Amino acid sequence: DDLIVWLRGDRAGLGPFSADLVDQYWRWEQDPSVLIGYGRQTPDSLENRREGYGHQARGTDDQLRFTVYDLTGQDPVPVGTTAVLIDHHVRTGEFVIQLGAGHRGRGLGTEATRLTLDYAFHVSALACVHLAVLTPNTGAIAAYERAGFRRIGERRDSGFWLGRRVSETLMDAVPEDFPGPSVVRGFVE
Amino acid sequence: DDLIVWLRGDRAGLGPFSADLVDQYWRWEQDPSVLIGYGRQTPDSLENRREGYGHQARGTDDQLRFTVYDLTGQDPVPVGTTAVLIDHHVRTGEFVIQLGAGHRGRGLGTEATRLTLDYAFHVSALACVHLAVLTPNTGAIAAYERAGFRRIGERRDSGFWLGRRVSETLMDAVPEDFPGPSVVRGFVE
Amino acid sequence: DDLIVWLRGDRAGLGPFSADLVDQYWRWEQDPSVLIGYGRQTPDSLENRREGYGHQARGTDDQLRFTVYDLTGQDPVPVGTTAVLIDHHVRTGEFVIQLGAGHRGRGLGTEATRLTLDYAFHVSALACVHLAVLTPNTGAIAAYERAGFRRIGERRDSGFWLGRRVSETLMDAVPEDFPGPSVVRGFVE
Amino acid sequence: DDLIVWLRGDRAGLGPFSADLVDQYWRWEQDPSVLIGYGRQTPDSLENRREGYGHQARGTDDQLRFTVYDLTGQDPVPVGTTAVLIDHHVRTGEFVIQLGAGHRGRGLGTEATRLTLDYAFHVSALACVHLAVLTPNTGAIAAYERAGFRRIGERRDSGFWLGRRVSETLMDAVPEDFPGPSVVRGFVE
Amino acid sequence: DDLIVWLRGDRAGLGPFSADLVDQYWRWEQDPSVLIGYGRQTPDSLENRREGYGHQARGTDDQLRFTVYDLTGQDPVPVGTTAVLIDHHVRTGEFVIQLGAGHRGRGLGTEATRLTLDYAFHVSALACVHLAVLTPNTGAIAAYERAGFRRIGERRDSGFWLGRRVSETLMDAVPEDFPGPSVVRGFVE
Amino acid sequence: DDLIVWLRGDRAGLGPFSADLVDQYWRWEQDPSVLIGYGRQTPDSLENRREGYGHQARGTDDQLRFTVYDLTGQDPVPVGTTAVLIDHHVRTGEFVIQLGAGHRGRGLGTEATRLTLDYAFHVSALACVHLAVLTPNTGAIAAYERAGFRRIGERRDSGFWLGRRVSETLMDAVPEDFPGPSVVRGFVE
Amino acid sequence: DDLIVWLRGDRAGLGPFSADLVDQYWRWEQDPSVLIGYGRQTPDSLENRREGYGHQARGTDDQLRFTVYDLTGQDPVPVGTTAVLIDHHVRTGEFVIQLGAGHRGRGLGTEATRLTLDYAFHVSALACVHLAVLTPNTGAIAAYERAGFRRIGERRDSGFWLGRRVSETLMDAVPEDFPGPSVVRGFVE
Amino acid sequence: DDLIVWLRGDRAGLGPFSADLVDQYWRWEQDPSVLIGYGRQTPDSLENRREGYGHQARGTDDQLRFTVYDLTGQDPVPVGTTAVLIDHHVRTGEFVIQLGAGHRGRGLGTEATRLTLDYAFHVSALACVHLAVLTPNTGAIAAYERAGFRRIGERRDSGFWLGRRVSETLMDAVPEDFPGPSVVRGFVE
Ligand SMILES: CC(C)(COP(=O)(O)OP(=O)(O)OC[C@H]1O[C@@H](n2cnc3c(N)ncnc32)[C@H](O)[C@@H]1OP(=O)(O)O)[C@@H](O)C(=O)NCCC(=O)NCCS
Ligand SMILES: CC(C)(COP(=O)(O)OP(=O)(O)OC[C@H]1O[C@@H](n2cnc3c(N)ncnc32)[C@H](O)[C@@H]1OP(=O)(O)O)[C@@H](O)C(=O)NCCC(=O)NCCS
Ligand SMILES: CC(C)(COP(=O)(O)OP(=O)(O)OC[C@H]1O[C@@H](n2cnc3c(N)ncnc32)[C@H](O)[C@@H]1OP(=O)(O)O)[C@@H](O)C(=O)NCCC(=O)NCCS
Ligand SMILES: CC(C)(COP(=O)(O)OP(=O)(O)OC[C@H]1O[C@@H](n2cnc3c(N)ncnc32)[C@H](O)[C@@H]1OP(=O)(O)O)[C@@H](O)C(=O)NCCC(=O)NCCS
Ligand SMILES: CC(C)(COP(=O)(O)OP(=O)(O)OC[C@H]1O[C@@H](n2cnc3c(N)ncnc32)[C@H](O)[C@@H]1OP(=O)(O)O)[C@@H](O)C(=O)NCCC(=O)NCCS
Ligand SMILES: CC(C)(COP(=O)(O)OP(=O)(O)OC[C@H]1O[C@@H](n2cnc3c(N)ncnc32)[C@H](O)[C@@H]1OP(=O)(O)O)[C@@H](O)C(=O)NCCC(=O)NCCS
Ligand SMILES: CC(C)(COP(=O)(O)OP(=O)(O)OC[C@H]1O[C@@H](n2cnc3c(N)ncnc32)[C@H](O)[C@@H]1OP(=O)(O)O)[C@@H](O)C(=O)NCCC(=O)NCCS
Ligand SMILES: CC(C)(COP(=O)(O)OP(=O)(O)OC[C@H]1O[C@@H](n2cnc3c(N)ncnc32)[C@H](O)[C@@H]1OP(=O)(O)O)[C@@H](O)C(=O)NCCC(=O)NCCS
């Protein structure tokens, strides 16, 4: 009961950024695969993450942070994190997502991104959600495309993939391109 | 016995803004339906709510905060929150209200608003209580109309409803339009 | 040359909220006519205004503050102040204006409000600008109507006019109702 | 002699971010045309700019800030500002530029951007310099294209132009696409 | 389960710089053999190491710190430490390593250095990793040579070995000289 | 008379790190040629240099800082800076040097480096002075070789020269290889 | 196991300056015989020693502090303290030693001093270790002579022995005069 | 008249440690000859000397500091500094002295040391004054011998002279060996 779930999809759900899962968030973010995908170069310390959780918690006016839950089992189980950095001046946000090592390839990322887009479009009233992802990360490309993102173009020589200089793909999503039924509309109506 | 009830209606009651219910207030305020109704775009953190409860508690000179109780059962059970921001210079206040997910549609909001208006008119000696509510939120419109509010007009293009730009309805209430018997008069006489 | 003018109309102009005019802003705001029009009940001190100017200056992210200049003479002369409190979440702002004692009735308020609306619509990208003004203040009503505001309704018994309890008129403006040519478009094109 | 010039082109030059020009930087940045081009919605105060200059000055490890000088006259005259926010992890930077009201259309922006790219490529050893510019700002598009930037794509509905929701064009530059002779190579060889 | 292992080789593995092992890190670093190999002259205190662990933990932006685990047994057991001081301006890092007294001569240092080089090359995207080691320390020379380092030269009379003034050997490693399969590539692909 | 000269060579001399020349030190260090030679990527601010001069001045226990004077004229004139970072544990130091734009190619760097080596060897009692210099900087190579440095080797791919990844040459100097007469011996005997 | 032993001789050993033995260090240092031998005139308080232990612990860059253990029994037992104050500028140190009341005359002081000299010569790379000891303290003279110290001379009238003004003997030790096998060499080879 | 002289000899005199001569004290102490004689390895900064003068001034309970004056001219002229660090527990002090570059070889050091010894013996009631001086510094040896110091012995390999490891001579002085008439006795009798 301690795990609150706000949006419930068919396969995944979103909840608050609970403080009981700071260690799990650290362990998820420190995985080498996540570091390669994000492009971060150095591991962060658990103490620094614990200290930074408070500053993340106070600064929630222009920041969306959700815990992704797997709803296929009897009870929800946290599997990843989604975040949107909101620029209230232009109604746009920047989207990031990561899942656990054992929860990838089961589809959860697609519905997690779709639910995050639903929340950003129908609750935060954002006009555009965009992201930057390294080109070789084709799985993330497919997940974002099926979630509702569209390709903008390639920013040449602005990232590293296994030490090699590669471009990154810029993608964006708009409310009129949002696929599937919206859970938020079910909440309102 | 810890749950103090000040005003007792037929279906609902009002009590103090207890500190034992900060987590419940957070959970009520973080519901997607409440966020859509209020028009808030980003969820707030539990730690920030716990920290802000103190600043709410000290600043009570020009702020009314009540906990709504359901009195249909054997014991009172908290179901929502009401608040009035008082401007002592002109004897006016701004009214907000929200109930829990499982307590809506049973009428409790109407008597909660009526009791809050009774307290504001006959204890706080306010000359006018007003609110701003999004136009598509028709249930709140009906609740406020039956509670004693009257429609002023529509403020064009000043809010978002499921990402769509919509107007909001401005409403006000005056003591001479207060319906039904007053509990405060029973307290005094 | 020290008086910077950003927007230049036919009769009036807008400039920055200069620190060399804090005493003049105080003297303008302390006039009994301005106190009656705004509805403020107690005079403010010059020292408090000087201290508060800094806090006004730092907090400019969601606040527009202009100095109104009379351009009918050879050189610009400050005659009043305009301000818009911006709510970036919904792209709306609240508008206030006051002129000097000897500068009223010459029309400067109308073009000052029109230029402020032009700046808010075409630079700040606001979807709605609204204000609250006491009903007996008919001159301000006419100025706002000719500037581009439209009447919403009357909020009953929410203000004092010469000690008498009176209602206040709520007005709003939208970009599609903006009259006349836009100076900002001339700046861009 | 107080105006130091580091890079000297045929028409323009770059110098340090002098503290004697904080007021001029403020006046340049506060022009309505610059606000429209950047997409900033509210004017900043002179006191806030003076206070922020120090924090800009200390934080120079990952920030390039230049003053653009017009070298067509007998002595250099400052006309604008260029800045590159450097991300040392991936050797990329984000580029912004603005000129004075009376210095546009004379070509100075093109050589200013070219010299900034030369400095970033041959001194800062950046692999990619990118920018985001509103689509209707066609003059900036042409200036960046002739300076050495290439179009990536359009980010839909992520900015405002005169109150209208418009897309912004993403551009990038790479060392192998740098046009013209390099001044830095003349410095080294 | 508390011992997290990120990279797993055939004989050794790398994990985070856990706070539960500060005393063990102190005891490893205070061994006379480690002091002779590093060239440190005075022992450090346990209290100073405990205090300094926090400052090490916060400063992780340009610092890699791993705990070396022996994977030959049933469960991982910490045996040493590896560290890389990263200079993000030139994509280079300085490498140090030490093992426990009872864990030397079993080969663990070679694979520990190889895995650290793999992490630095394919996750941190470093172009060169270098170290300085005293010339008489021939075992470390052989370990670094088999791990992937190449000899640069000897810096004359810049260190002490058992009180005698000796030179130190400078070594470096580049991605194109990295031997063996890469674990990070297995993580990505 | 304010310019103190400690060591006097035939062409150049060394003096204290005077506080009257902080602006000149800034201007010398900010030259693009000096930035290319050192490998620094971003310019530093004058205010930051003025603030950092104090911290340089207090920390003089393990730091040598000299002002290079040209003694060919009637009076000494400052032309550059030399610095040695001393590691008292092993009696070694790291050497850097830069001259002004108009003072290069006249030989002053060679005698400045020779006098700095004389001071480090015969006053600081250092056993080895070493430096790291980019390979394409052949003029500095020749200056260091004639001053008394000897080549150690090349550290592959650890620096940038005009945006190109290049190696840097490591050099060292020992007292027994010090050329020419020593001024310090003339001081003592 | 809590008692760490670094250097192990035939009769005595050296370990870290443990914080669990602050009271024992106080009791050893407060003995009247130790006060007479050192020449200290007033007893120190236990609280002051406990407070000063921290400042001793942080300041370990130029300070060697060991706990002397008696290794003749089954388990090591602390019997005294040795300390060397290191002057890194000239590679020299000042040596002091004291043992417990019941541990003197068994030879432990000789091997404790010899092991401290071994550590200072072969780990700290000190060129000279010196001490000052009162002339009537003949037992300490013999211990230092057999440990490896040589007599320099007598400093006339610079100390008190039982209230009588006496001279003190100055002694020094050099690496080439170090007797017996070195444990540190066994550690290295 | 500002130059106070306490003890007046035939050729030299002693005065207070005036604050008007901090720059002159710095310049005297920074001379390469003084650095070689004392054995200091790095120059000190003028700002650090100015800051440290205050801490020298407050701490005068166990510190004698004099300014040496040349009395051969019409008016006293400062030529050097003498200092005695007093250990009040044993009535002993450590003596240092330095003169200006142009004031050596005229004998002033001998009478300066003699007057300092007179002050220490007959005013401070010290039983022994000692010093440590490098062996090759034969001029200081002769000056101390004629002043009243006697040789104790040589501390082997504890100092550097022009980079060469040399011994230092230890000397002491006692009241019964004080030569010549005492000025302090003339003051008292
Ligand atoms: C990308 C990531 C965040 C999650 O996205 P994702 O879950 O992998 O993307 P998907 O949801 O499409 O994975 C679903 C896979 O299951 C398959 N699948 C399809 N239908 C399915 C179903 N009904 N049930 C189960 N699996 C299904 C899909 O084909 C897909 O394989 P594919 O993506 O190669 O086409 C995760 O891979 C990750 O943690 N990456 C590391 C961090 C990172 O890269 N972040 C992004 C940086 S911007
Ligand atoms: C609006 C809100 C705060 C509570 O008001 P409310 O309880 O829904 O309004 P009501 O009391 O009229 O709901 C009573 C319903 O029960 C019905 N009802 C009538 N008589 C009843 C009775 N005797 N017993 C039970 N139910 C009855 C009413 O017809 C009404 O349906 P209707 O409102 O559609 O006409 C709640 O809906 C809510 O939490 N909204 C989200 C937050 C929010 O919107 N706040 C306002 C923003 S300004
Ligand atoms: C309202 C106020 C801010 C300025 O607005 P304003 O300048 O008075 O409104 P106007 O510009 O229409 O005054 C112009 C008058 O000149 C007349 N006029 C018309 N054309 C004109 C022209 N070409 N040239 C000169 N005068 C002209 C107009 O008829 C108008 O009279 P009217 O307003 O009664 O119809 C000023 O009156 C004031 O300082 N009030 C006190 C503070 C206050 O009330 N603030 C508002 C609280 S919300
Ligand atoms: C864009 C800006 C920063 C400077 O760039 P710019 O100087 O206008 O771009 P240019 O250098 O090409 O202007 C040169 C003009 O002179 C013309 N020109 C060509 N050759 C010329 C020559 N030899 N001499 C003089 N003029 C010449 C060019 O055709 C060009 O006209 P065009 O740009 O429409 O084709 C300036 O317009 C500005 O301040 N904008 C507001 C702030 C802003 O928009 N910043 C960018 C937000 S990302
Ligand atoms: C150097 C040090 C850090 C670890 O490196 P290392 O483990 O000793 O180097 P190695 O891995 O090659 O030791 C493996 C030995 O086992 C032998 N070996 C070879 N194959 C083996 C196998 N399959 N299984 C077991 N042992 C094997 C090797 O021949 C080697 O002996 P050698 O190094 O003399 O040739 C460790 O010695 C140490 O702690 N030193 C003190 C601190 C220090 O010196 N740090 C470096 C300062 S820069
Ligand atoms: C390198 C630097 C610091 C000064 O060193 P330098 O003065 O250039 O080296 P030199 O003293 O040899 O220059 C003397 C030149 O004059 C010539 N020369 C020879 N004899 C001469 C004489 N008697 N009189 C005048 N000139 C003479 C030499 O041939 C030499 O040319 P060369 O160096 O190409 O062979 C300066 O070039 C500089 O500021 N560089 C930028 C910063 C930098 O690179 N620092 C080093 C980074 S580690
Ligand atoms: C001096 C002191 C620190 C320890 O040094 P020490 O142990 O007394 O000196 P020793 O090791 O030689 O004592 C060993 C004695 O055992 C005898 N001995 C010789 N061989 C022995 C053996 N194999 N086994 C046992 N005893 C032996 C020695 O003859 C010696 O007697 P001696 O010193 O009079 O010749 C201790 O006496 C002490 O605590 N003094 C008070 C503090 C102090 O004075 N500090 C020094 C101020 S600088
Ligand atoms: C040592 C020092 C502090 C001053 O001492 P000093 O003045 O040189 O020693 P003196 O007074 O003997 O110099 C007098 C010289 O004049 C000669 N002299 C003798 N009688 C003389 C007279 N009547 N008139 C003039 N000169 C005379 C002496 O023979 C002597 O030469 P000598 O010392 O080689 O024999 C000074 O040399 C100095 O500044 N040294 C650098 C700092 C330093 O070394 N400090 C000591 C470190 S512990």
Side-chain angles (χ1 to χ4, degrees), chain G residues 41 89-92 127-128 130 150 152-160 165 170 172 174 176-177, chain H residues 41 89-92 127-128 130 150 152-160 165 170 172 174 176-177:
Chain G
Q41 276 135 15
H89 288 256
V90 294
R91 312 312 301 167
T92 66
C128 182
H130 60 89
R150 299 290 183 269
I152 298 168
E154 280 179 32
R155 181 188 291 157
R156 294 172 297 169
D157 301 346
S158 66
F160 290 97
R165 177 76 75 175
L170 307 178
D172 58 16
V174 295
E176 55 268 14
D177 272 356
Chain H
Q41 276 135 15
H89 288 256
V90 294
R91 312 312 301 167
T92 66
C128 182
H130 60 89
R150 299 290 183 269
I152 298 168
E154 280 179 32
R155 181 188 291 157
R156 294 172 297 169
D157 301 346
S158 66
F160 290 97
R165 177 76 75 175
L170 307 178
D172 58 16
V174 295
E176 55 268 14
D177 272 356

Side-chain angles (χ1 to χ4, degrees), chain C residues 34-52:
Chain C
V34 174
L35 294 172
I36 292 167
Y38 280 12
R40 285 185 287 133
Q41 276 135 15
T42 61
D44 216 6
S45 66
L46 184 56
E47 293 82 13
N48 190 36
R49 189 65 174 81
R50 288 170 173 171
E51 184 267 338

Side-chain angles (χ1 to χ4, degrees), chain D residues 59-118:
Chain D
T60 187
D61 189 50
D62 58 359
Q63 183 62 255
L64 301 176
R65 297 190 182 286
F66 305 99
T67 302
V68 179
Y69 294 92
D70 180 352
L71 301 181
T72 61
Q74 200 267 318
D75 285 342
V77 55
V79 296
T81 300
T82 60
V84 179
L85 178 73
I86 296 174
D87 183 343
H88 285 296
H89 288 256
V90 294
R91 312 312 301 167
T92 66
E94 179 191 31
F95 168 78
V96 298
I97 177 168
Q98 63 84 30
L99 303 177
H103 307 294
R104 301 162 194 161
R106 288 157 57 194
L108 295 170
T110 301
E111 292 83 4
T113 301
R114 189 180 69 85
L115 289 166
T116 301
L117 289 173
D118 189 20

Side-chain angles (χ1 to χ4, degrees), chain E residues 41 89-90 128 156-157 165, chain F residues 41 89-90 128 156 165:
Chain E
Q41 276 135 15
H89 288 256
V90 294
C128 182
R156 294 172 297 169
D157 301 346
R165 177 76 75 175
Chain F
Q41 276 135 15
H89 288 256
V90 294
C128 182
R156 294 172 297 169
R165 177 76 75 175

Side-chain angles (χ1 to χ4, degrees), chain G residues 47-113:
Chain G
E47 293 82 13
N48 190 36
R49 189 65 174 81
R50 288 170 173 171
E51 184 267 338
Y53 180 92
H55 292 281
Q56 298 288 16
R58 283 85 170 93
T60 187
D61 189 50
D62 58 359
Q63 183 62 255
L64 301 176
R65 297 190 182 286
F66 305 99
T67 302
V68 179
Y69 294 92
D70 180 352
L71 301 181
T72 61
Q74 200 267 318
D75 285 342
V77 55
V79 296
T81 300
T82 60
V84 179
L85 178 73
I86 296 174
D87 183 343
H88 285 296
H89 288 256
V90 294
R91 312 312 301 167
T92 66
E94 179 191 31
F95 168 78
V96 298
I97 177 168
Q98 63 84 30
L99 303 177
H103 307 294
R104 301 162 194 161
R106 288 157 57 194
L108 295 170
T110 301
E111 292 83 4
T113 301

Side-chain angles (χ1 to χ4, degrees), chain A residues 41 89-90 128 156-157 165, chain D residues 41 89-90 128 156 165:
Chain A
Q41 276 135 15
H89 288 256
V90 294
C128 182
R156 294 172 297 169
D157 301 346
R165 177 76 75 175
Chain D
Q41 276 135 15
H89 288 256
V90 294
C128 182
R156 294 172 297 169
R165 177 76 75 175

Side-chain angles (χ1 to χ4, degrees), chain B residues 41 89-90 128 156 165, chain C residues 41 89-90 128 156-157 165:
Chain B
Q41 276 135 15
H89 288 256
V90 294
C128 182
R156 294 172 297 169
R165 177 76 75 175
Chain C
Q41 276 135 15
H89 288 256
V90 294
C128 182
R156 294 172 297 169
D157 301 346
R165 177 76 75 175

